[PDB]
């Protein structure tokens, strides 16, 4: 199970550096949304550039790191885009 | 010819503007003559209030395109019919565009005037001007503004006085790849320019009714960080992309919104706009400017690196932000009628900055710093006969030089001090209540000082506050006459007497006062450490048993120095106070320990106590750890340094300070785990820096080893600076003074390749600490090359060189030989004030009197009053060195053992 998390900041001139990234690419490695959930080692491949990094929180799950759409009766742990010492944006959710 | 209206400096009452539209287009590349320029156009709509056959409007350094043979086109409004233009002319001394009409305008008819014009986008930090910076190998050019006080007229023609309030419709035409910013938000997204799609057009919502000096226009490649305030206002911090990405705007973001919301709640008055931008310019004269919705900062007042800026830099940022946000009420919403009441803007913002900064950082106790930073800073100048009243008669303020002269310690620090005293005698809640009424009543209007007393009088009446007389009659004593009283206490009888405190008792006070220099004074006092009942002094002399003592009792007046007065005591009370300091100084409040020091040195200089009493008040400092009494001592003894650091007295003086500071230096060495840690309390951090700086100045050799080893360690590992930012300024200067060409060349390259301005500032001052004279001469030549030191830093660096005893004569000779050239090309006031404060001989005085004579016809502009104050101080210094040299020399020798 691999969870890819990437984002880019707004581009060009006059950008908000700490606002939510304009581009986000959350990819679960073999998930298909219409086929539904994906059911051995969890992996994380988050973005890391300058002061910006990607993280995954624990949310309701009693464990700490499968769908990008809600799994009724499950726990959704949010995928975050964090600016070191300033702002954190929920850019996604990984449901289990 | 003063008979002609266009030769007079005030505008006629005949025309009032109603609204403007202005379109400006900066060209951020040089033209074939090598100039950066901006092209622009404007329409002003104005009402004729009194019939006149001339339009007089302000215009500075603008070249006009001729339309129909004239510099303007005049049009009617609502069916009014304008006369033909006979002639237009520019009158340079009064900075007017004059439009002569073949007939008179009609009373109450509106008219519109169209103009098309060009101007230089100069590196002069005034009007609409260019700021530059490097992004990699590429030099970026920014277009940006500074209109206060009288430079809006330099960007577009307008009725450029602060009571000529109007609304403004701003359009900026800019390169397609650059953002445009103004006071308001854009009316919609930026559109291409039809004639050339490499340019875009941005148009901004109409401003509120506003003064011309508050307009701002900026075109840059800046990025920003954003946060929405608790009152819904959008806050953005704008700076160079690399500074924003690194986080140097993040502290300003953390505090700007909360402070703005705090002031809105505190004064019961909303900030009436959707957004407040804070922007940091690489090139900026005055530190910060309060433009409504677009506050402009000097980088060192806005940006902050938590790993490389010091605690004093952080205090600077939050204080200036709080000062500018204060102006959004005192200055932008309610505005001065004319520049003679400047303290209504700047005194309020200098007081209220501490309330906002205290709100954002309540662990710092910044409100206490107002005594050193404002009260005692301004009493130095307000004790001269060459001082001026908080409110000056408006007839006396006319020219731009006279206006700029008022941006001084009187308008700022004395304004702040009387508001500190005015907000102490009556409750702060009572104070803010009357100010809320004032803000509500005069919103979008203009005020004189009498309007302030009325709304404070309502608050005292509504709060059942008892006072000896009206707010009006109390505060006119502190506002319409210069100076302050000294209160002299006889503690055997409990008698108080007051008189005008003057530095030199032989000074000639020529400005009359309608109160004959008598004040109405709120007296706080403590007895043996317990606060007594308040008292009001209403006569020149009075008695109350509050001020009577017996036995071992001592009393102090002016608890925590809330009043704007100096206190002198009889001989017995002084001796008991000195005994208290030796036995247990903690029984005297920390602020009043600084009061005891600072008053005695100033009283001694005025021949009101013996100079040995003032010096004896410094004996307890060997066991003092607080920042404030030491700082008041080091500040008062900087006069002794200035008088003696070229004389045999300086050795013994340094010997005394070595003996007084060395235990405190050893304490901090210990308390910091050998300078590896810094204190938690902010005042303790400042006390540490003062202890290190004083140790190294006066020759504690453990300090000289410490600073040179750190700086040697830095030079050996340049990318890993081992010096904590709190110590960089003292470490850098002393390492440069003790070092050679290698230490200087290293710090110069570190200044040229600097990315933080807070770091370049420390290196720029420290490089003036060279003891080699040939180095200081090279450095002085650098300060006037804009490729090496920014024009915004030239005076500041020259002053750092003059503070060096080796540089004193170099700069004074430079000033004397280059005055004409310098002036015809920059704070002449601060340079005059700094280059002359060592003067203590008749020889220095005749150079100063001759420096006056040699340049009388060029004039001195806004330096005019600093020159008269220098003449008065120099004369007092000659007498003071005569009367004190031997007494002071002997005291230092005896007490440094
Ligand atoms: C500046 O812009 C404002 C708003 O766009 C203009 O105000 C309008 O002016 C016309 C003519 O006086 C009125 O009929 C409208 O009702 C006004 N609108 C509002 C909202 O008041 C103003 O005239 C412009 N001024 C200049 C000099 O261009
Ligand atoms: C005088 O100023 C001092 C601050 O320098 C005040 O003393 C502080 O008082 C508050 C409240 O009592 C305490 O929390 C602080 O810890 C005290 N600080 C110090 C240095 O002791 C004092 O209250 C002021 N006095 C008056 C009446 O204004
Ligand atoms: C999203 O991420 C995956 C895995 O890193 C990558 O293969 C794909 O190209 C990305 N999509 C876009 C639009 O960049
Ligand atoms: C996802 O699954 C649906 C079947 O549910 C299929 O139609 C679609 O092509 C699949 N996408 C991919 C890329 O496999
Ligand atoms: C404005 O006109 C004067 C007088 O000819 C000239 O010296 C100046 O350079 C002009 N301004 C610009 C920006 O060219
Ligand atoms: C300039 O206008 C173009 C076209 O409308 C637009 O795409 C771009 O965002 C604008 N640029 C700025 C800096 O406003
Ligand atoms: C800004 O505030 C946040 C939250 O208190 C904090 O984490 C961050 O360190 C602050 N940044 C600065 C530069 O003070
Ligand atoms: C004082 O009271 C009157 C009547 O209640 C009120 O109109 C006025 O606004 C009050 N002034 C202040 C400053 O509170
Ligand atoms: C200063 O202290 C010395 C030492 O006791 C004393 O003799 C002298 O009178 C003091 N000076 C004054 C005027 O307080
Ligand atoms: C600090 O002072 C204490 C007591 O004098 C001593 O034990 C300790 O070694 C000192 N530390 C240093 C190195 O300053
Ligand atoms: Zn100000």
Author numbering:
A (entry chain C): 302 to 340, 346 to 371, 385 to 415
B (entry chain A): 66 to 890, 896 to 967
What text appears in the publication on this structure?
The coronavirus S-protein is responsible for both host receptor binding and fusion of the viral and host cell membranes. Its ectodomain is composed of the N-terminal S1 region that harbors the receptor binding domain (RBD) and the C-terminal S2 region that mediates membrane fusion. We find that an invariant set of core interactions defines the interaction with hAPN across all the RBD classes characterized.
In Loop 2, they all have a deletion of two amino acids that allows Arg 357 of Loop 2, the last of the absolutely conserved residues, to form a stronger salt bridge with Asp 315 of hAPN than what was observed in the Class I complex. As a result, Leu 405 makes the apolar contacts with Leu 318 of hAPN, a role played by Trp 404 in the Class I complex. As a result of the twist, Arg 316 emerges from a different side of Loop 1 where it forms a salt bridge with Asp 288 of hAPN in the Class III, IV and V complexes, which is not possible in the Class I complex. The GGG motif (313-315) at the tip of Loop 1 in Class I is a GVG in Classes III and IV; the presence of the valine residue (Val 314) leads to an increase in the van der Waals contact with hAPN. In Classes IV and V, the conversion of Gln 311 to Arg 311 permits a weak salt bridge interaction with Glu 291 that is not possible in Classes I or III.
